[PDB]
Amino acid sequence: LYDRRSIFDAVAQSNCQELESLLPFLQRSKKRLTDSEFKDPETGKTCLLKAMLNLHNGQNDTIALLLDVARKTDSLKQFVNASYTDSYYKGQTALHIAIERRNMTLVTLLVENGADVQAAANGDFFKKTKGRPGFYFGELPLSLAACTNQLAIVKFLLQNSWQPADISARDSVGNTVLHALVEVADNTVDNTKFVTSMYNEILILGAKLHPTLKLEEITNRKGLTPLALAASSGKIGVLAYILQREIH
Ligand SMILES: Nc1ncnc2c1ncn2[C@@H]1O[C@H](COP(=O)(O)OP(=O)(O)OP(=O)(O)O)[C@@H](O)[C@H]1O
């Protein structure tokens, strides 16, 4: 037998043995790894998510086993895609965390077992500090992966076989990855530099993958193109960058 507590402890120490008798348990009781009872009743955290927090050296194979179990009952999709429900981390999925942790291997794994690449992490933890904070990138995996300057994962999100990212999706505020990048600028020289070329990179990928899309024309919920946001919020280095590119 297994209660929520039993597994969460097993996960905490990366124990793949105490979960030997796992699969056969919810075969008898036909319980699901996704049942109400197997989540924290106030956050919506699952064992996979506990595993995501309890990393040791960016590794945990309780994950690999946990996923494996979910397919055998085919809890698979809704398991890998369960989100936080507390006001703080609301809408955060395991894929968000893998990226937050800069972990290709776990991004790769989650996407292959069908992580939703468009899932919006929209809780107060993913918007501007109360101050609380903090920190906004907004919302969507691609946006995250860019705003944290993680090119390879930006590429893997957009290019993968399993679910390519929608490069033009808008977060709750209307912002696309180009909008979010403008928001993440802070007018320091190294800041400009990284935003500026990640921006460049996104456009190069837009034009390579989906040529019809006029990315820089897309307005956030306040009617602002990325450029116009840049200028509304005194993000000058980037403003200068965006206009200089249009000039060629
Ligand atoms: N996206 C995140 N990034 C960084 N830290 C996070 C994130 N989400 C949650 N945390 C931190 O990890 C903690 C949860 O860690 P863990 O999953 O080990 O929970 P616990 O409360 O120690 O154990 P249990 O869930 O078994 O009671 C949260 O309280 C929070 O401080």
Curated annotation (Swiss-Prot):
Location (main, coarse): membrane
Highest taxon listed in the record's lineage: Eukaryota
Result of altering Q92A: Strongly reduces affinity for ATP
Expression (tissue specificity): Predominantly expressed in trigeminal and dorsal root sensory ganglia. Expressed also in hippocampus, cortex, cerebellum, olfactory bulb, mesencephalon and hindbrain. High expression in the cell bodies and dendrites of neurons in the hippocampus and in the cortex. In the brain detected also in astrocytes and pericytes (at protein level). Isoform 1 and isoform 3 are expressed in brain and peripheral blood mononuclear cells.
GO MF annotation, one: extracellular ligand-gated monoatomic ion channel activity
GO cellular component, one term: GABA-ergic synapse
Modified sites of kind Phosphothreonine: T34
List of residues that carry Phosphoserine: S6
Annotated ATP binding sites: R5, K45, K50, N54, Y89, K90, G91, Q92, E100, R101
Keywords assigned: ANK repeat, ATP-binding, Calcium, Calcium channel, Calcium transport, Calmodulin-binding, Cell membrane, Cell projection, Glycoprotein, Ion channel, Ion transport, Lipid-binding, Membrane, Metal-binding, Nucleotide-binding, Phosphoprotein, Postsynaptic cell membrane, Repeat, Sodium, Synapse, Transmembrane, Transmembrane helix, Transport
Keyword Glycoprotein tagged: yes
Impact after mutating S6A: Abolishes phosphorylation by PKCM and enhances channel response to capsaicin by PKCM
Compartment(s) of residence: Postsynaptic cell membrane; Cell projection, Dendritic spine membrane; Cell membrane
PTM characteristics: Phosphorylation by PKA reverses capsaicin-induced dephosphorylation at multiple sites, probably including Ser-6 as a major phosphorylation site. Phosphorylation by CAMKII seems to regulate binding to vanilloids. Phosphorylated and modulated by PRKCE, PRKCM and probably PRKCZ. Dephosphorylation by calcineurin seems to lead to receptor desensitization and phosphorylation by CAMKII recovers activity.
GO BP field: behavioral response to pain; calcium ion import across plasma membrane; calcium ion transmembrane transport; calcium ion transport; cellular response to acidic pH; cellular response to alkaloid; cellular response to ATP; cellular response to cytokine stimulus
Effect of R4E: Abolishes capsaicin-evoked current and binding to resiniferatoxin
Disulfide bonds: none
The ANK repeat ranges on this chain: 1-28, 43-75, 93-118, 139-166, 175-211, 225-248
Function, in words: Non-selective calcium permeant cation channel involved in detection of noxious chemical and thermal stimuli. Seems to mediate proton influx and may be involved in intracellular acidosis in nociceptive neurons. Involved in mediation of inflammatory pain and hyperalgesia. Sensitized by a phosphatidylinositol second messenger system activated by receptor tyrosine kinases, which involves PKC isozymes and PCL. Activation by vanilloids, like capsaicin, and temperatures higher than 42 degrees Celsius.
UniProt subunit comment: Homotetramer. Interacts with PIRT. May also form a heteromeric channel with TRPV3. Interacts with CALM, PRKCM and CSK. Interacts with PRKCG and NTRK1, probably by forming a trimeric complex. Interacts with the Scolopendra mutilans RhTx toxin. Interacts with the spider Tau-theraphotoxin-Hs1a. Interacts with TMEM100. Interacts with PACS2.
Domain-level remarks: The association domain (AD) is necessary for self-association.
Misc note: Responses evoked by capsaicin, but not by low pH and heat, can be antagonized by capsazepine.
Family the entry assigns: Belongs to the transient receptor (TC 1.A.4) family. TrpV subfamily. TRPV1 sub-subfamily.
Record-given protein name: Transient receptor potential cation channel subfamily V member 1
Positions spanned in the full protein: 111 to 358 of 838
